[PDB]
């Protein structure tokens, strides 16, 4: 649909790499949706221009600017920079529904069916499964929800010191209400649960639709051998394949 | 209710300690339900007699006996000893509904409301949260279900090499169907998620109703200082308090 989007976020050039890989993965699996990326001014012109090619829309967010609605809350809780920036995904009222995906996710199959879901649909978090992981979620842009999230951020902050605590606190019926708001874990498959919980992977992890690179060493903190097509494991190598294949050439293209 | 029960299982004297602590924890939080314990002949007379005091019913299961319905399946899949024994929880047709709890769980509050639940209700597993953890679950005893589980055990075994894989495979709609069959994580709170996922604990882990001692070192593999009332952490110490207070005296009582 025209007014639906995957939305991601990048606050720096490291994460812009992820966002570019994510965007590409989404294009590769023939999404019929828009691709939007929240970006900060800290993202350089080269990453930016590549984001402009990969994404239908590049939105600038500067919570460091006092014009930003999140800025006073950033002052109150300065650890919440990334969180308050991320929450701007709710400002995107040019879209009726979006799938937010962190820039450290990777799409391995079309996940457009996520748009059948209602706010707030998200996959369970490993570790504390009565929380949803905020790495992938379905939400409806709204200035009201935005303001309410912003307000909760101000009042409580996040029990996680990040967006996950904040989102779970506001969307707190997730655990106990409407199983359709549980996204299958395969739509936000923790790369940790692929290596750590290895019995459950073998049986279901070949079904993965989205890899969420958690931790730790993010995909781009790895060394990739372009000859062997392998890092210094399966999923890191898909990410790097996309990076090497689609993203680097788009990045090297901006220097002329 | 008269014909409802918590059911646990012990295949040896190490686990009988857990079962005795579990049973006691259940009595301590004034359950109105029956307490049943599947036991193997490998459980010694002393553990047994103490089980007889703590539990309303002590049921003997010997899958090593060829009279047992599970025995031929044990022959086919000998790694499934514990699993096939556990599955006998479904034979307990003297009960209309039961809560099965592994002998490495600990009850910290009345959880009798679990009997409002239908088969198969269970808490999500940490690590792979689209599986339920088989440490605590609500089920309806039935020879049909039993036979069907036994049959699946024979055909597929368990993708986990344990009961969890088997149960998830048979009760495979759990992830996607009926949010009421998701037991809050606090009814099967992984002791690992208490130490490992520490941000989510502080906010919700004080609400714990059942601790599931996973791993690893089981509670009884720890040294307990009875003077300091502490092990060699909060939950280990509740377990040991119950053990020292209620269980050991019941065990020392059998030697005369
Ligand atoms: Cl439901």
Curated annotation (Swiss-Prot), chains A, B:
Glycogenin participates in the glycogen biosynthetic process along with glycogen synthase and glycogen branching enzyme. It catalyzes the formation of a short alpha (1,4)-glucosyl chain covalently attached via a glucose 1-O-tyrosyl linkage to internal tyrosine residues and these chains act as primers for the elongation reaction catalyzed by glycogen synthase. The modification N-acetylthreonine is found at residue 2. Glycans are attached at residue 195. This is Glycogenin-1. Belongs to the glycosyltransferase 8 family. Glycogenin subfamily. It catalyses: L-tyrosyl-[glycogenin] + UDP-alpha-D-glucose = alpha-D-glucosyl-L-tyrosyl-[glycogenin] + UDP + H(+); [1,4-alpha-D-glucosyl](n)-L-tyrosyl-[glycogenin] + UDP-alpha-D-glucose = [1,4-alpha-D-glucosyl](n+1)-L-tyrosyl-[glycogenin] + UDP + H(+). GO terms for molecular function: glycogenin glucosyltransferase activity; manganese ion binding; protein homodimerization activity. GO terms for biological process: glycogen biosynthetic process. Detected in heart, skeletal muscle, brain and testis, and at lower levels in kidney. Keywords: Acetylation, Cytoplasm, Glycogen biosynthesis, Glycoprotein, Manganese, Metal-binding, Nucleus, Phosphoprotein, Transferase. It is an enzyme of class 2 (transferase). Its main location: cytoplasm. It comes from Oryctolagus cuniculus. The modification Phosphoserine is found at residue 44. Divalent metal ions. Required for self-glucosylation. Manganese is the most effective. The record marks 86 as: Important for catalytic activity. Changing residue 163 to S: Loss of self-glucosylation activity and 18 to 30-fold reduction in its ability to trans-glucosylate maltose. Reduces UDP-glucose hydrolytic activity by at least 190-fold. UDP binds at residues 9, 11-12, 15, 77, 102-104, 212, 215, 218. UDP-alpha-D-glucose binds at residues 9, 11-12, 15, 77, 86, 102-104, 133-134, 160, 163-164, 215, 218. Mn(2+) binds at residues 102, 104, 212. Its cofactor is Mn(2+). Pathway: Glycan biosynthesis; glycogen biosynthesis.
